[PDB]
Design a protein around this ligand. Structure first.
Ligand SMILES: [Ca+2]
Ligand SMILES: [Ca+2]
Ligand SMILES: [Mg+2]
Lengths: 280, 117, 198
């Protein structure tokens, strides 16, 4: 009940644009009366079918061969993280075995189990297979709070879909909620901005269109320098109130030395393998 | 942004050998350092500090972006800084992407992405 | 062995044995697998080398019955470690054999063959300077219904019998449930059990 309720609140939020993607649930337990009521409150957008993901007959029943993606939620509060990871690995194996070319989004509790999973022959991270590793992302968010305190809160609030909430009281909560009302989006931007610098289109977009750009599509570039020119046909990683606002970014045309210091890729510092007693 | 880069090369290396292996310095290695790093900076000193009491977030956003190639996605504002009375509380909170018209106070910190040297 | 000596010791036409042992796992009895390879109607130059990859605790809980055989080696690693399987020359073996001891301790009927399936997929998803799909591989499964995950090109159906499944018809999978006809065969013809045994 809580897993589906939280998923449907984020998937069907009014701040996204007018998407009409149907949601089909596959589970081997008959839903209780409160889940049946939750599906009745979403009667035109949610369907449930009772079956096992490990059964090719059930996979054909839910028409997984024509689905746009398959999402595999995980039990974050399970007693045995290893057992939960093994079960999720088996589910991924079964889905890929039935249909190798299905986009799979899954939650993985540990990082070694994520490494175990990515060895699957059909597991293609380029095609869109995303293993959202909870321990990895949470420890990365904690580390970014060590570079700038509050950044874990800053990042987490950019994903959850939230409407504007306003109250008459002058309290820190009003300002906080006003800040929380913005999410990170992604869309293609006008030919009227091709040929300009990234700082220039940022100061243009900032309050005239009311849109802030963090990055653009040498592909994924976090906060480009002043020396980079906007390619034709590119997309911007906007932060905005919603998706219907970032449409402006498109719909505008002048409407006014042998030391090994690093890893093999040159992205992390490195040293020789220290003994445990040396660092104790 | 969160793991400080994990390009497909590193994802292959950690999948085959399951440890980081040290590399000798190369021109491509020294080019791979150029990517932005997230920062906080103070509003009480340095070139930004003329945005004292009553400054506009739009002015700060504009001058930071124009002159230091730097832009801010939020303010780490003190909880009690909106009150009239002084308080000993040092707790702050994240304000995300505020309006151009949004009002500054001199005790503030700014979240931003900054260049590499 | 370890990583260094395994990698520099050239191996080809060998047998690689992948064991998911544990300190609490049951004894597989690897003697019965080694002895047919070690039989004397092969010349000594024709004896295929054997290397065991698995938990060092389980190897030191069974080595007490394998010290009188030649051409054997242990590598104390993980059967799912790509580095170990590359160091063991997995692409040049005459067989890879995958066995699991943790089959009776747990009762889930879902995770019994998870390790074996994952190891098989990891070996089939290897790039060699040829792919890992052409490697000679055999794996032992506890549940016959888990055989559908071994191959991807084949069509899968739970109703289809194990003998009819493609991975078994190719000699890629083996389960102890196919031996149940030996009761009836043995009874009707008393010499069949000794002909098979010899
Ligand atoms: Ca919003
Ligand atoms: Ca199959
Ligand atoms: Mg419907």
């Amino acid at each position: 009940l809580e897993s589906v309720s939280n998923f449907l609140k984020d998937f069907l939020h009014k701040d996204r644009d007018d998407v009409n993607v149907e949601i089909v649930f596959l589970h081997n337990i008959s839903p209780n009366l409160e889940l049946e009521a939750l599906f009745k409150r979403h009667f035109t957008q949610v369907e449930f079918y009772q079956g096992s993901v490990l059964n090719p007959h059930d996979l054909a029943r839910v028409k997984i061969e024509s689905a746009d993606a398959c999402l595999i939620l995980a039990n974050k509060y399970c007693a045995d993280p290893d057992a939960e990871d093994a079960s999720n690995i088996m589910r991924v194996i079964s889905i890929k075995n039935y249909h190798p070319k299905i986009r799979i989004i899954t939650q993985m509790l540990q990082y070694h189990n994520k490494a175990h999973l990515l060895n699957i022959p059909s597991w293609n991270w380029k095609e869109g297979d995303d293993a959202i590793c909870l321990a990895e992302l949470k420890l990365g968010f904690i580390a970014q709070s060590c570079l700038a305190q509050g950044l874990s809160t800053m990042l987490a609030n950019l994903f959850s879909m939230r409407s504007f909430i306003k109250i008459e009281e002058d309290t820190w909560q009003k300002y906080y909620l006003e800040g929380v009302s913005n999410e990170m989006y992604t869309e293609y931007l006008s030919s009227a901005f091709v040929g300009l610098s990234f700082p220039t289109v940022c100061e243009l977009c900032f309050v005239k269109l009311k849109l802030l750009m963090i990055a653009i599509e040498s592909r994924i570039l976090i906060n480009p320098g002043n020396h980079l020119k906007i390619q034709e046909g590119t997309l911007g990683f906007f932060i905005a109130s919603d998706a219907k606002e970032v449409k402006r970014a498109f719909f505008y045309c002048k409407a006014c030395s042998n030391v090994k210091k690093y890893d093999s890729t040159g992205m992390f510092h490195w040293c020789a393998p220290k003994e445990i007693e040396k660092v104790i | 942004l969160v793991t400080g880069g994990a390009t497909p090369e590193l994802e292959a290396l950690i999948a085959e050998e399951n440890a980081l292996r040290g590399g000798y310095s190369t021109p491509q290695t020294l080019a791979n350092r150029d990517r932005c790093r997230v920062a906080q900076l103070a509003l009480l000193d340095g070139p930004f500090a003329d945005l004292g009491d009553g400054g506009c977030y739009g002015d700060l956003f504009c001058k930071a972006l124009k002159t230091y190639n730097m832009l801010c996605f939020g303010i780490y504002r003190l909880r009690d800084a909106h009150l009239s009375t002084p308080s000993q509380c040092t707790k702050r909170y994240v304000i995300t992407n505020p309006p151009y018209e949004f009002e500054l106070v001199p005790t503030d910190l700014i979240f931003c992405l900054m260049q590499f040297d | 062995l370890t990583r260094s000596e395994a990698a520099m010791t050239v191996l080809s036409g060998h047998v690689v044995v992948c064991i998911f042992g544990d300190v609490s796992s049951a004894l597989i009895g690897l003697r019965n697998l080694v002895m047919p390879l070690r039989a004397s109607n092969f010349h000594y130059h024709e004896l295929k080398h054997i290397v065991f990859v698995g938990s060092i605790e389980y190897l030191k809980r069974e080595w007490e019955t394998l010290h009188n055989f030649p051409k054997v080696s242990i590598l104390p690693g993980t059967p799912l470690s790509r580095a170990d399987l590359r160091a063991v020359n997995i692409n040049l073996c005459d067989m890879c054999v995958i066995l699991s001891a943790n089959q009776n301790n747990i009762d889930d009927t879902s995770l019994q063959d998870k390790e074996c399936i994952l190891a098989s997929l990891n070996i089939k998803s290897m790039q060699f300077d040829t792919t890992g799909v052409n490697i000679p591989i055999i794996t032992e499964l506890v549940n016959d219904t888990n055989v559908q995950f071994l191959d991807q090109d084949d069509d899968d159906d739970p109703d289809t019998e194990l003998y009819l499944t493609q991975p078994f018809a190719c000699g890629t999978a083996f389960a102890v449930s196919v031996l149940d006809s030996l009761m009836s065969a043995t009874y009707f013809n008393d010499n069949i059990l000794t002909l098979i045994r010899t």
